[PDB]
Coordinates of C-alpha atoms in Angstrom, one line a residue:
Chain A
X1435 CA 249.3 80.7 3.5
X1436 CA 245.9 80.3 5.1
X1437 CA 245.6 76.5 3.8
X1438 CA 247.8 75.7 6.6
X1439 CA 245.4 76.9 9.3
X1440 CA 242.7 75.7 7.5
X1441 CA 244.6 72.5 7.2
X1442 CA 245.2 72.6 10.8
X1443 CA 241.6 73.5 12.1
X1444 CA 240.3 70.7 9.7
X1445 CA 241.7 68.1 11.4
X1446 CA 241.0 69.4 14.8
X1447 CA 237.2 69.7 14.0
X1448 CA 237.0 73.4 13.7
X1449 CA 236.8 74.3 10.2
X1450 CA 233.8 76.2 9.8
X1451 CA 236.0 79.0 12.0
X1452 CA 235.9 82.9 11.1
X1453 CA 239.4 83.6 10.3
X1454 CA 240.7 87.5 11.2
X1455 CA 244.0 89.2 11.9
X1456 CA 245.7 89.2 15.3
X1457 CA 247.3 92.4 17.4
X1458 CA 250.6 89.5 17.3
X1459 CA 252.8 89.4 14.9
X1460 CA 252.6 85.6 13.2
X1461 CA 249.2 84.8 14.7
X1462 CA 245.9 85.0 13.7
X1463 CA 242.8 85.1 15.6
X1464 CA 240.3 82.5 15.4
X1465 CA 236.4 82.6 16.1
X1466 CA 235.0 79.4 17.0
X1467 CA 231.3 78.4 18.2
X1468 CA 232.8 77.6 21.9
X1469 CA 235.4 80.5 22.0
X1470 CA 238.2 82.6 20.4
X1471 CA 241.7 81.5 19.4
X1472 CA 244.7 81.9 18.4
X1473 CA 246.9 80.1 16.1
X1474 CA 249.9 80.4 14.3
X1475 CA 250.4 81.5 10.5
X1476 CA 251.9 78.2 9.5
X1477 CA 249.1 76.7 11.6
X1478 CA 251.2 75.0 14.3
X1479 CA 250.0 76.3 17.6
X1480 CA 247.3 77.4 18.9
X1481 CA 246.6 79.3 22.1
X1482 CA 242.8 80.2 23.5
X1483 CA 241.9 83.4 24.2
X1484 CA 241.2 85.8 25.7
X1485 CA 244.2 88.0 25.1
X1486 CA 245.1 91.2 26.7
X1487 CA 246.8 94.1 25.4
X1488 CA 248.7 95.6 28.7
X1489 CA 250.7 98.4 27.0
X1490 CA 248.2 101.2 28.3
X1491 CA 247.7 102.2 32.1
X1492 CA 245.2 99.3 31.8
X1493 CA 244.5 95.9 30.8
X1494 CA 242.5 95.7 27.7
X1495 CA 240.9 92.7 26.4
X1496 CA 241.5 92.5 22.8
X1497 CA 239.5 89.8 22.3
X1498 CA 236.7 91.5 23.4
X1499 CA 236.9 94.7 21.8
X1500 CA 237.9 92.6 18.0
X1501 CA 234.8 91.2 18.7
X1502 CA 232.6 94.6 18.6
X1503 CA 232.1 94.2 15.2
X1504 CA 230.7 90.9 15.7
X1505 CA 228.5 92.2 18.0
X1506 CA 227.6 95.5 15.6
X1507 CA 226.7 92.8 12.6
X1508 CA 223.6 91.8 15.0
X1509 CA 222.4 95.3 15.7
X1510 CA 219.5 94.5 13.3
X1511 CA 218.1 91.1 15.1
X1512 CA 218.9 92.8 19.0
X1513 CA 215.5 94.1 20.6
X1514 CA 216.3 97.3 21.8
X1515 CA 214.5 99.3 24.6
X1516 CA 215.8 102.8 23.7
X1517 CA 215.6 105.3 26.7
X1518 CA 213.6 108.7 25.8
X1519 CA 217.2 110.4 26.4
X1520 CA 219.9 108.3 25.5
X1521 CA 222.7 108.6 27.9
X1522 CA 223.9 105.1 27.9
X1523 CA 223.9 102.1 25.5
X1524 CA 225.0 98.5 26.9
X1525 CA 223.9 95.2 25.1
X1526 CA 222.3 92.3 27.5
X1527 CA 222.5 88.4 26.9
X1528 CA 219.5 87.9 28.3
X1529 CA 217.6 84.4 29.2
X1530 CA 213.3 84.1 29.7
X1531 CA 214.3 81.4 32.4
X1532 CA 216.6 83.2 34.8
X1533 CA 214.8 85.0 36.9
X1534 CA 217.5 87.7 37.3
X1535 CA 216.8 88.3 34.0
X1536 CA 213.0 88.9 34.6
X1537 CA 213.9 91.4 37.5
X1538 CA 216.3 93.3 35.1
X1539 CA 213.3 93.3 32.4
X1540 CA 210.5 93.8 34.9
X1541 CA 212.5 97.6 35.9
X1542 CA 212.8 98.4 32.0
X1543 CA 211.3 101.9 32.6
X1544 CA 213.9 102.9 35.2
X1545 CA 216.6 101.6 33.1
X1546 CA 215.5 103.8 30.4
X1547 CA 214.5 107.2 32.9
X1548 CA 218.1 107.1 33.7
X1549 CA 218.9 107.3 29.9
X1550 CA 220.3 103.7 29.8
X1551 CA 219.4 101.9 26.2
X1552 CA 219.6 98.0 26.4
X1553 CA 219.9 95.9 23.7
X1554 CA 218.6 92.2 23.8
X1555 CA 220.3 89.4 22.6
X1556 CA 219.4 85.4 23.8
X1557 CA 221.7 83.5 25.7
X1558 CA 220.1 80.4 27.2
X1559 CA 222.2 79.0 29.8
X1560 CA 220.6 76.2 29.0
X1561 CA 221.9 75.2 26.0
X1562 CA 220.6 75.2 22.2
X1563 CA 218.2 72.3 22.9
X1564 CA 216.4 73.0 25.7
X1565 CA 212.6 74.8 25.5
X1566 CA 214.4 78.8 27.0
X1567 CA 215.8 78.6 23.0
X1568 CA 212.7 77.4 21.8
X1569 CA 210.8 80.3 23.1
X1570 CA 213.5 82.6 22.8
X1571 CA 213.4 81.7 19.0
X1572 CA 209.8 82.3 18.5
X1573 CA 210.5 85.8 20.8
X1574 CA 212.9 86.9 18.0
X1575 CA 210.6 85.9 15.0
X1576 CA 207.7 87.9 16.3
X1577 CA 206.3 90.9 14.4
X1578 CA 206.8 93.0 17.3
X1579 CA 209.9 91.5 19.0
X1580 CA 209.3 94.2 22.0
X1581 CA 205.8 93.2 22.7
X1582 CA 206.5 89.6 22.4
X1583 CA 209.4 89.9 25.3
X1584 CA 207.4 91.9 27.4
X1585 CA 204.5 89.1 26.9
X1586 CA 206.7 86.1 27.3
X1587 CA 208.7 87.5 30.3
X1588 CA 205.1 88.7 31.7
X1589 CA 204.2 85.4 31.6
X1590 CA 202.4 85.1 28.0
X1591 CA 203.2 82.5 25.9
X1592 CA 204.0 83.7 22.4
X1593 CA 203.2 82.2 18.8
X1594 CA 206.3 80.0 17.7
X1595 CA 207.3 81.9 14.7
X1596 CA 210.0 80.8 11.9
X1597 CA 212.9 83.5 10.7
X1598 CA 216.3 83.8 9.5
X1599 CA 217.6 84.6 13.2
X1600 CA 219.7 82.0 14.8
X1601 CA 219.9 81.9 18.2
X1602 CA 222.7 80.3 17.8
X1603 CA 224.4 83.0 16.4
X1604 CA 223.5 85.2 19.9
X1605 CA 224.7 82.1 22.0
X1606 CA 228.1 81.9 20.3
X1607 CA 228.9 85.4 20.1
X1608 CA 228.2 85.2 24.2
X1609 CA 230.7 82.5 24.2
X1610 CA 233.2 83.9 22.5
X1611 CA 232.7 87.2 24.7
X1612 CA 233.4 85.0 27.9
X1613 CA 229.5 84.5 28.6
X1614 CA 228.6 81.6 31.1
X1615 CA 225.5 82.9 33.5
X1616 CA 222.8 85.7 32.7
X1617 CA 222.3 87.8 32.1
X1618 CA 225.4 89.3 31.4
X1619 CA 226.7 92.8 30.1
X1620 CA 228.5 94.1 27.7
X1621 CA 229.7 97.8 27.3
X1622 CA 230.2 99.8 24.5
X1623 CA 233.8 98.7 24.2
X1624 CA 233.5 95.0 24.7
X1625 CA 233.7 94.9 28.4
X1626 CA 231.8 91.7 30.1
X1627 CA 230.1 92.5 33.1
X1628 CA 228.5 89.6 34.2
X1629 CA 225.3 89.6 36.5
X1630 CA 222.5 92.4 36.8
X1631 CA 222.5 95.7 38.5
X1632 CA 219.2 97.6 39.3
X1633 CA 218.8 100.6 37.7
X1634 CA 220.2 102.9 40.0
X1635 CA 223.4 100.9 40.6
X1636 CA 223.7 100.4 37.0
X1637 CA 223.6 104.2 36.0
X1638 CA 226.4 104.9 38.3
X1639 CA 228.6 101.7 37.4
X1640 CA 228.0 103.4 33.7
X1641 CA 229.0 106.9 34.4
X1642 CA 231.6 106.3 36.7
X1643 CA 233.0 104.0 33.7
X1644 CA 232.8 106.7 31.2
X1645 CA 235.3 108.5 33.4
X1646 CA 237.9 105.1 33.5
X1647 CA 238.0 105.0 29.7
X1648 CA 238.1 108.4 28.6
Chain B
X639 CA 226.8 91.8 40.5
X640 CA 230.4 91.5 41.9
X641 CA 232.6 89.1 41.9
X642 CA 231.0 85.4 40.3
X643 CA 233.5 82.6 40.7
X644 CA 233.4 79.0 38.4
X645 CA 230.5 76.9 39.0
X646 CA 232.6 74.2 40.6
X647 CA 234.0 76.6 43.0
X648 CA 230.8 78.0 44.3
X649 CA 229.3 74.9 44.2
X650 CA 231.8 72.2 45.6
X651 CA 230.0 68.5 44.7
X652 CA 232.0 65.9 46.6
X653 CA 229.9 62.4 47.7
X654 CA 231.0 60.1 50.2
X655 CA 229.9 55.9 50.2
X656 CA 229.3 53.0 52.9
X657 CA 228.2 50.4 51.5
X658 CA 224.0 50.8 51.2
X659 CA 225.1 54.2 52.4
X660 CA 225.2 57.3 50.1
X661 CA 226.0 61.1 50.6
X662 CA 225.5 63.8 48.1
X663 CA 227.4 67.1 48.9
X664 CA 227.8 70.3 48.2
X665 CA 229.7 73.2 49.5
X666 CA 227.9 76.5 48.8
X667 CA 229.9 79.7 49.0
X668 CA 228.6 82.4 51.0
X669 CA 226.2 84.5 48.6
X670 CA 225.0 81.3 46.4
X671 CA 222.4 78.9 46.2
X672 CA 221.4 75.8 44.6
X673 CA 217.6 75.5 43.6
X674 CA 216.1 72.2 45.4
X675 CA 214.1 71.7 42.3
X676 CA 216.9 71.2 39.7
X677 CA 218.0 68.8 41.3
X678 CA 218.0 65.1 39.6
X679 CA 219.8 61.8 40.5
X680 CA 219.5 59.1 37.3
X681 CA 220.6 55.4 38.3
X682 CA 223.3 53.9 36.2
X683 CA 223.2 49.8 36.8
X684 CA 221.8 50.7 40.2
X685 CA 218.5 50.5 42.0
X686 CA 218.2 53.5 44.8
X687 CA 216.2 52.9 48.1
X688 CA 215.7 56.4 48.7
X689 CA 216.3 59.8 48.2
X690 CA 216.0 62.6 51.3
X691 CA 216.0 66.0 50.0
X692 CA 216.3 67.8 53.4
X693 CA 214.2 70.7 54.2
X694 CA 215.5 74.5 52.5
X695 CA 214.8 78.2 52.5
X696 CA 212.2 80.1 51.1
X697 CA 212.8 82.0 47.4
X698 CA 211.2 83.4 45.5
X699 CA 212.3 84.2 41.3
X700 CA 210.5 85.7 39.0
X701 CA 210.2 82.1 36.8
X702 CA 210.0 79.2 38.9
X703 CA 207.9 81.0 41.4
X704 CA 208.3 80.2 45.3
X705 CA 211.2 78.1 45.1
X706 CA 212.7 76.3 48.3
X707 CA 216.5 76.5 47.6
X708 CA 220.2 75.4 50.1
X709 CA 222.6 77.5 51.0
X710 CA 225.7 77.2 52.8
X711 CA 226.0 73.7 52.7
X712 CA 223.8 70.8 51.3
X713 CA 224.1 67.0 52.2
X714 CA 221.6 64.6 50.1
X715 CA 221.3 61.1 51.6
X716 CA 220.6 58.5 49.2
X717 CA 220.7 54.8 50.6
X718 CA 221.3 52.1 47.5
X719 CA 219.3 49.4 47.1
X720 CA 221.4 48.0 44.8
X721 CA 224.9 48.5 42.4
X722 CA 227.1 46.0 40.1
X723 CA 230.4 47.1 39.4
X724 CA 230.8 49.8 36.9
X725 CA 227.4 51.3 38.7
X726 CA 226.5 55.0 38.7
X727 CA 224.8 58.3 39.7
X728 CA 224.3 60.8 37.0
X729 CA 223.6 63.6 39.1
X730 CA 222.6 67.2 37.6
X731 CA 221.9 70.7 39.2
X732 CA 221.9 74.3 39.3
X733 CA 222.4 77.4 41.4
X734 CA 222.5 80.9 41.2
X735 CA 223.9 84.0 43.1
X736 CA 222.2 86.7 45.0
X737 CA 224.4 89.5 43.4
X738 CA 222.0 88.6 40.1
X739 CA 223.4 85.9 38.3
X740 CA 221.9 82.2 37.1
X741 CA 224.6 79.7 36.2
X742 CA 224.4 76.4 33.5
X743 CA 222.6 73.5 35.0
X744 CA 226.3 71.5 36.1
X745 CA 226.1 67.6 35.9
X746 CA 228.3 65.1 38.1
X747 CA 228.4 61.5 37.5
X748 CA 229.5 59.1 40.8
X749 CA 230.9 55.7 40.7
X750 CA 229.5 53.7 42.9
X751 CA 230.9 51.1 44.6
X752 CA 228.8 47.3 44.3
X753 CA 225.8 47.1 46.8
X754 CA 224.3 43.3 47.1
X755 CA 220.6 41.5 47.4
X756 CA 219.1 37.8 47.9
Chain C
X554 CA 271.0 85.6 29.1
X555 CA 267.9 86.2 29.8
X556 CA 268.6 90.0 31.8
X557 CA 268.8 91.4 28.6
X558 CA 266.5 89.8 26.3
X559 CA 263.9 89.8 29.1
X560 CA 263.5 93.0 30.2
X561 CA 260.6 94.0 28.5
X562 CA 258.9 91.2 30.0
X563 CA 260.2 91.7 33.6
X564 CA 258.9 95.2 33.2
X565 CA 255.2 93.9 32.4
X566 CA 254.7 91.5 35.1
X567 CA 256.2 94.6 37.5
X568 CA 253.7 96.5 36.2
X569 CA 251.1 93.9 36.9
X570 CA 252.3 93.4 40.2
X571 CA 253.6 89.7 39.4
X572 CA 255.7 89.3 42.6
X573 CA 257.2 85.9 41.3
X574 CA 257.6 84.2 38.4
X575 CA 259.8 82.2 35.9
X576 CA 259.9 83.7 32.7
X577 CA 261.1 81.0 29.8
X578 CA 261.0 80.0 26.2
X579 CA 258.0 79.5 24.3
X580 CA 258.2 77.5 20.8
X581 CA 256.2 80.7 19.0
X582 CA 258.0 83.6 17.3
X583 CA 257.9 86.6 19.7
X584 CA 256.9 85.0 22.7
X585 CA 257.8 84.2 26.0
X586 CA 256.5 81.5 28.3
X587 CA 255.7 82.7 32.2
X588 CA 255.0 80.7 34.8
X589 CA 253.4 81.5 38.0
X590 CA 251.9 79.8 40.9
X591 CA 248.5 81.2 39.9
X592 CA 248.8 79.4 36.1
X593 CA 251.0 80.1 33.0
X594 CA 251.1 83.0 30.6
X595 CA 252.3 83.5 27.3
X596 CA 253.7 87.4 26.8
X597 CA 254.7 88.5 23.9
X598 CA 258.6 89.8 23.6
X599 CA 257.8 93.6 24.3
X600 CA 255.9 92.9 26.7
X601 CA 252.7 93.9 25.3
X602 CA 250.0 91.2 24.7
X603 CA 249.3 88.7 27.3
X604 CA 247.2 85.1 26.7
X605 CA 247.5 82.6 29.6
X606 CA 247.9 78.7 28.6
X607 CA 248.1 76.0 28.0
X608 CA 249.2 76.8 24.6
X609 CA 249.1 73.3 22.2
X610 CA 251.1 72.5 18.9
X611 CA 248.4 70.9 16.9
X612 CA 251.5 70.0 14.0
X613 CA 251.0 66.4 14.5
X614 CA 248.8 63.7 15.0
X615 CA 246.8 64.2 17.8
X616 CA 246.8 68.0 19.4
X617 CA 249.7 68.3 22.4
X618 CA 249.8 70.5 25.3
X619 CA 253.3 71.8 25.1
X620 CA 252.7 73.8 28.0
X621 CA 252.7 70.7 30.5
X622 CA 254.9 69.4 28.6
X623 CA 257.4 72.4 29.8
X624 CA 256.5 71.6 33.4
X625 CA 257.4 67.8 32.8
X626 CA 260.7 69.0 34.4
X627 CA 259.2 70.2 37.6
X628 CA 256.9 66.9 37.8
X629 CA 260.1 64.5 37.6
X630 CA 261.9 66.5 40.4
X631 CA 259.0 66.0 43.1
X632 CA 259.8 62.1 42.1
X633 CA 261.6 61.8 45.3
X634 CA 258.2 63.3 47.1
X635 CA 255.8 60.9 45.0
X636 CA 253.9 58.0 46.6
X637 CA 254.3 55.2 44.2
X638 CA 252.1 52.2 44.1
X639 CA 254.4 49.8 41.8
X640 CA 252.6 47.7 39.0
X641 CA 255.0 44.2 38.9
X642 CA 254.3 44.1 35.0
X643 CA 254.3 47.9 34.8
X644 CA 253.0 48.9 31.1
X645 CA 252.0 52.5 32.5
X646 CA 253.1 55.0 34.8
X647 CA 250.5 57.7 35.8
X648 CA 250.9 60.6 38.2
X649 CA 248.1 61.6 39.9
X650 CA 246.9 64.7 41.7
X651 CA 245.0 63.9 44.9
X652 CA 242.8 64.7 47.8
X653 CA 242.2 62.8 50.6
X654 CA 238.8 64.5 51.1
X655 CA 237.5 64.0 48.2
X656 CA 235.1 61.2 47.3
X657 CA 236.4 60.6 43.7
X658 CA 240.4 60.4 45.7
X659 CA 238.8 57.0 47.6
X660 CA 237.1 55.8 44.6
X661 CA 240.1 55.6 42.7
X662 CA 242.2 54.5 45.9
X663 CA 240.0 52.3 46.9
X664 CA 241.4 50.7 43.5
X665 CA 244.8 50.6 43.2
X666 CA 244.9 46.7 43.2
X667 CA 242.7 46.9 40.4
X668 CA 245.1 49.4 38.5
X669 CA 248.3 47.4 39.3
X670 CA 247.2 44.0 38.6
X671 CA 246.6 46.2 34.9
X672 CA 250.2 47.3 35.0
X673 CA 249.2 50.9 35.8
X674 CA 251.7 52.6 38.3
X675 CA 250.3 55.3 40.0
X676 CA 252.7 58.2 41.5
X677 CA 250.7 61.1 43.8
X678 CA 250.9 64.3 44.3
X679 CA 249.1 66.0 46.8
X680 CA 246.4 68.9 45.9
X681 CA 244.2 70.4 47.9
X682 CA 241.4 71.9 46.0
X683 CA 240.8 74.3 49.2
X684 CA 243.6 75.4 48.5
X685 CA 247.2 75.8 51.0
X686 CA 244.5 77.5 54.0
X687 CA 243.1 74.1 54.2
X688 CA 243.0 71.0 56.8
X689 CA 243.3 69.1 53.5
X690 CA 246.6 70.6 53.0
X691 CA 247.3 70.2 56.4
X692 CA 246.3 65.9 57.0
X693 CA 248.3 65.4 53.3
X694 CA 251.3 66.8 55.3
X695 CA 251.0 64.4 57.9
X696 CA 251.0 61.2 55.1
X697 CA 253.4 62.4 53.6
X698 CA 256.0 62.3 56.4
X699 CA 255.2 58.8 57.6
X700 CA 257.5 56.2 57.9
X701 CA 255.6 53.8 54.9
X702 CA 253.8 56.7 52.9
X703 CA 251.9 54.2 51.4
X704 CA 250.6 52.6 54.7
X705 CA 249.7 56.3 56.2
X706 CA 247.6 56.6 52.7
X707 CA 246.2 53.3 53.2
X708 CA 245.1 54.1 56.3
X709 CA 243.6 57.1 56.2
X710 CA 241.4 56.6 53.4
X711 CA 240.4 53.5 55.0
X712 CA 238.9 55.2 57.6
X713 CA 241.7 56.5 60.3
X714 CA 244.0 59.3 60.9
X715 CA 247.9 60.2 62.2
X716 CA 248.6 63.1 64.2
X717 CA 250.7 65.5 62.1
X718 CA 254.6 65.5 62.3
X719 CA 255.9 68.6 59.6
X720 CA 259.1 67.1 57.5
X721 CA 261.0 67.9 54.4
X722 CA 258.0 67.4 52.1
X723 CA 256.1 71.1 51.1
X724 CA 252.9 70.4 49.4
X725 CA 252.5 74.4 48.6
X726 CA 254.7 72.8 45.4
X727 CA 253.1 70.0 44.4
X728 CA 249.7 72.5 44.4
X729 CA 251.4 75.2 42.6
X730 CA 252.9 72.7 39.6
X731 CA 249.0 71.2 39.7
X732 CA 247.6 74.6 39.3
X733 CA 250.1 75.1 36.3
X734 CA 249.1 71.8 34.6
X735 CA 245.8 72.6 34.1
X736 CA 244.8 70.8 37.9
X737 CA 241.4 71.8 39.2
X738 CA 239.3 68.8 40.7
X739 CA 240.8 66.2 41.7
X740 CA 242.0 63.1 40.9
X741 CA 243.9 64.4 37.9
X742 CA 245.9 62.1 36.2
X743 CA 249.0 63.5 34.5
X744 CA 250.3 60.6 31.2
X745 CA 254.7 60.7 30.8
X746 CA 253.7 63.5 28.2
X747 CA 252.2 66.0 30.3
X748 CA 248.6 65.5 28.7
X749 CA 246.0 66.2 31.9
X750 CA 243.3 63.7 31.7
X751 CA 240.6 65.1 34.7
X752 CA 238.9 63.0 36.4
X753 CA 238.4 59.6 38.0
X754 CA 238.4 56.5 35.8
X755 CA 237.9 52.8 36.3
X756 CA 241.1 50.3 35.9
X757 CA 239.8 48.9 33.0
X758 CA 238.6 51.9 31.2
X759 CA 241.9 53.8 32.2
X760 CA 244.2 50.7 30.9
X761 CA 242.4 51.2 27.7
X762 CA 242.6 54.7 28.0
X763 CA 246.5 54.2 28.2
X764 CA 246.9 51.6 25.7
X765 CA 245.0 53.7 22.6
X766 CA 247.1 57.0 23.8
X767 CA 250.3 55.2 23.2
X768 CA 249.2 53.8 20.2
X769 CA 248.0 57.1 19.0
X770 CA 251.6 58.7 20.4
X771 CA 253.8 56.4 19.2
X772 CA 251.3 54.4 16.5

């Protein structure tokens, strides 16, 4: 029933894979450390994602928007910089050794003045080995995860503290979301938008958006 | 942030040998650069003579500070010493793109060819 | 029959703007196999969901890419356009995906002997990874209209040149089926099953590399 795509990712080297329902009929949808994909319910093929759904007027990535509740089960380990009025919410991979990523943090206020929210999760480019997790780690342990950001991305080394968040978790979700560089976007509905946008830019890339979806 | 194409496209790494003669390349597409910093060449069964990072721009990122990086095009002459059979370059970098994006360090490994000694 | 049973599909890629394609069977329930010159897709029968390949049937042994294995066909009619390098005790026939530009196209060249004396035949195809607006596109035209293909190969990646003569030969195919396998640095070497190994390899780690896939394929 299942045991034949458990079976199947077993000997492939993929067991410990999230296993969820796929918009195809006969196909399930499989979430992986290095990506989504999709496999057959007698566990015979497999396909990697992303897919599309083009029924509508446009392209949607169903992929991407399955994986919104993914995203929504690390709401609690994010560090969020909520603007006074909220207008906008988008989720950042973000990584302490990209510099774009420091310019993007370093105008923080202006995001936030133009009612933009951003919510933090890491994503070293690097990898899960080298020191950007290490720090990034200890960033996500901290007391004060907002404080220890700012310090770290200010420059301030921070106190390598021990939790239960996995940065891990942050880098695969990336992964799975199509993530490669930072720091990368993602919108409310699953959208990746890659690279960084000054505040100004950004606000209108958001608004106009609001209008393309609704 | 517009369009950002693979790694191996906006960073083309091709190398070209005569005998003691080596040439690292790269191709940069038009809004990219590679940091002249990141760059590392480890010796595989090879001894090199030389490496001659030429001479790049001035950048400056909010982590590695004032950063000399290539753009356009980059050619890294490295003249071997030395190289049995089987001999290589492990060769690792990274770039980025002005439209506000940092990409995965990439890593390219070159056969050489054999190089002799007395 | 396709007209009927198809129309669903034709609709999509119209609606997508896919100018050209070749829309064919695909082993899963549902779905359709497309091919285009920009990759293959997998749509679903009414034409709904979209995932692009290659799609693999991980029933057996070893995980297969049934997508290449499709465009198998298409590889075994540019035979007649292939530049063969014959292996006297051939044990292995590889086609290979090359540019004269690149460095890792010379390396593996510069090696043939190597590869034959191992009984590895090598067929090429030409791909320019700069693409069909290339000069690389444009000097592999000119080999491949020579007299002795294999001299005009020989010779320019030892170190010389031909001035162009346009023939029979179009590369734009040999670059499209590469895109469709899975082709994007070159060399690629394609094994008789369609499995896309990327990458240069030396004689004697490729020989190996042969002789444990064909155990493994055929135990």
């Amino acid at each position: 029933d299942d045991a034949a795509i458990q079976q199947t990712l077993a000997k492939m080297g993929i067991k410990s894979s999230d296993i969820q329902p796929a918009p195809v009929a006969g196909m399930k949808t499989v979430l992986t450390n290095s990506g989504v994909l999709y496999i057959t319910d007698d566990g015979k093929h497999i396909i990697q994602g992303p897919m599309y759904d083009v029924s509508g007027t446009a392209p949607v990535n169903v992929t991407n928007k399955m994986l919104l509740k993914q995203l929504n089960a690390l709401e609690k380990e994010m560090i969020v910089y909520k603007a006074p009025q909220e207008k906008h919410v988008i989720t950042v991979f973000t990584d302490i050794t990209c510099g774009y990523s420091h310019k993007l943090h370093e105008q923080m206020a202006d995001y936030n003045a133009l009612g933009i929210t951003v919510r933090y999760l890491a994503f070293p480019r690097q990898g899960l080995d080298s020191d950007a997790e290490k720090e990034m780690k200890a960033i996500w342990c901290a007391k004060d995860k907002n404080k220890a950001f700012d310090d770290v991305m200010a420059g301030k080394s921070v106190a390598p503290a021990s939790c239960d968040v996995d940065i891990a978790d942050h880098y695969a979700l990336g992964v799975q979301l199509g993530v490669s560089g930072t720091p990368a976007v993602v919108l409310s509905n699953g959208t990746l938008v890659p690279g960084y946008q000054p505040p100004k830019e950004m606000k209108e890339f958001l608004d106009e958006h609001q209008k393309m979806t609704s | 942030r517009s369009q950002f194409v693979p790694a191996d496209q906006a960073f083309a790494f091709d190398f070209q040998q005569n005998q003691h003669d080596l040439n690292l390349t790269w191709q940069i597409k038009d809004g990219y650069y590679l940091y002249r910093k990141q760059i590392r060449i480890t010796p595989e069964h090879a001894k090199i003579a030389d490496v001659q990072l030429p001479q790049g721009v001035w950048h400056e990122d909010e982590f590695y500070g004032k950063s000399e990086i290539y753009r356009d095009r980059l050619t890294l002459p490295v003249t071997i010493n030395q190289a049995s059979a089987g001999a290589t370059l492990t060769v690792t970098y990274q770039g980025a793109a002005d439209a506000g994006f940092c990409y995965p360090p990439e890593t390219k490994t070159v056969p050489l060819s054999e190089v002799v000694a007395n």
